Design a protein around this ligand. Structure first.
Ligand SMILES: O=C(c1ccc2c(c1)CS(=O)(=O)N2)N1CCc2[nH]c(-c3ccccc3)nc(=O)c2C1
Ligand SMILES: O=C(c1ccc2c(c1)CS(=O)(=O)N2)N1CCc2[nH]c(-c3ccccc3)nc(=O)c2C1
Lengths: 294, 289
């Protein structure tokens, strides 16, 4: 059957690296790295997610704090907090949990965060830089995905890859990473990439997946990817994080049970990509702390 | 056989639209738009392209000066020159012709042009905005390809598109425009897009192209696309400009299988220049920032 890849395990490794790198940075007598998180309102998943990131920083020896605010808050307000933090030399990374309330403009918030602290890599300059294959604060989930692939020894160069979904902070950067030149400042995957989305016809999607050596799903649609869609031996990465009921639980976009018996590798949900996301956040924070980039 | 779309005719159309918009704009009492072009060294094609640009400016009533310089220029000189132009409130759009000499950092330059006068759309902020589907100054060849498609009337939503090439200023932006959400600030094609490049083996190219409702070729390789690669009836867009000058496609042959096709010369090339005029008037109007 399919090698199942543990994102839980892989992420724990990665955090171990980070722990050490931070240990080193402090023992050379640099300041201990500080991550600030802003959380607005009360989405319960959102809470869970900050909790995750607060733990991770604890584990790897990074100082954390979560500044909570009521959904009641205004855009101008939020910008002032963000402005406080950009100037607090104690804060190395600054991250704004999403989504924000509809009366706050996400893009403007994202570009408020100083790019040098932008551990989410959602600032316009980081996006620009990533799209031009330059060094940048890479976004965590796409970077996670790439780490899964690169650490499992799965090749990409020359290979056919489909990414379903095209969100600006997951699908598009994944596709950007995977298709680009291995030779540029920020190496990419040199794969041949297909972007699918909410207006791909299921038959046309399937027609592309069937040719795919790697299928990467970030649609947020259960049972989107079924074993009849997948070539034999293929690697299947599940970025989906879908909340259904059967008691209330969580699934990917892959038919795990089906696909597992056709695929050469697969990631579980839970315990695949989610934790890899939190791991790369820790990577970006140490990087931010070392003032490496701009 | 296959309808040959006239790049020349469409570029005429767009140029006419810009001429009118410029006249109204001047007639309302605004400054007549000015575009400066920096030329460096003495590349034959560079010189020809710069002239193609200033020609189109005059045709649509935009003022232009093509400032031509020696390869031997220092990079810091150039940055100082650009800062002049960035600062001259008389310049609305400034574009640096490429390629520059191996001794100068394109990226440092491209990023030195004011985003607000960056008619080529190659400033990192313009690339960023574009990749986030925000309003932005679109790069001209990508926007040209798109206009050719929207104008000819070829649907894109749901459809299957393939793009050969991933250059940061042609192929990648094309692939960006075509796959993204029609609903966004800067709408996109809502197509299903495949990006191929130099590590795509012909086997794989063909395996994708044949399912392609629209194939867009921007690889810079004679004859790359042959009619067995194409699905009969499909739209084929030849963004190639290669000095043997012909395209990336096989014209005569492909022409019989394809539903639509674009020549070379007389295809995308002239459109690229048209869209630059569109961008210069947008610049002059200071809509964006
Ligand atoms: O913190 C986690 C996390 C950790 C572990 C884990 C999961 C998620 C799902 S799991 O596979 O059960 N295990 N994440 C990954 C998913 C995730 N997704 C979003 C989010 C919000 C809106 C839109 C798209 C993504 N914001 C976030 O901040 C996070 C953080
Ligand atoms: O100036 C033209 C142009 C206009 C019309 C036209 C052709 C070319 C070939 S044609 O079909 O004979 N008609 N272009 C389009 C191609 C083009 N290509 C490059 C360029 C820059 C660096 C490297 C390679 C090409 N720089 C440019 O600035 C332009 C502007």
């Amino acid at each position: 059957e399919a090698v199942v890849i543990s994102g839980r395990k892989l992420a724990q490794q990665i955090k171990q690296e980070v722990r050490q790198e931070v240990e080193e940075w402090v023992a050379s007598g640099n300041k201990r790295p500080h991550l600030s998180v802003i959380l607005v309102g009360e989405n319960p998943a959102s809470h869970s997610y900050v909790l995750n990131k607060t733990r991770a920083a604890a584990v790897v020896g990074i100082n954390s704090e979560t500044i909570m605010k009521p959904a009641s808050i205004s855009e101008e307000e939020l910008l002032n907090l963000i402005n406080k933090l950009n100037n607090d030399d104690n804060v190395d990374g600054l991250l704004v949990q999403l989504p924000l309330p509809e009366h706050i403009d996400e893009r403007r918030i994202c570009n408020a965060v100083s790019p040098d602290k932008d551990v989410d890599g959602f600032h316009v300059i980081n996006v620009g830089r990533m799209c031009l294959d330059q060094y940048s604060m890479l976004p965590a989930t796409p970077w996670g995905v790439w780490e899964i692939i690169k650490r499992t020894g799965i090749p990409t160069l020359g290979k056919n890859v489909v990414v379903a979904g095209r969100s600006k902070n997951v699908g598009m950067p994944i596709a950007m990473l995977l298709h680009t030149d291995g030779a540029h400042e920020r190496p990419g995957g040199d794969a041949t990439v297909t972007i699918s989305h909410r207006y791909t016809p299921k038959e046309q999607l399937k027609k592309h997946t069937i040719l795919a050596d790697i299928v990467i799903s970030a649609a947020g649609i259960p049972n989107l990817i079924t074993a009849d869609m997948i070539k034999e031996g293929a690697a299947v990465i599940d970025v989906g994080i879908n909340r259904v009921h059967d008691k209330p639980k969580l699934v990917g976009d892959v038919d795990f049970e089906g696909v597992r018996q056709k695929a050469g590798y697969i990631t579980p949900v839970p315990g695949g990509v989610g934790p890899m996301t939190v791991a790369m956040l820790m990577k970006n924070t140490i990087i931010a702390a070392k003032k490496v980039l701009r």
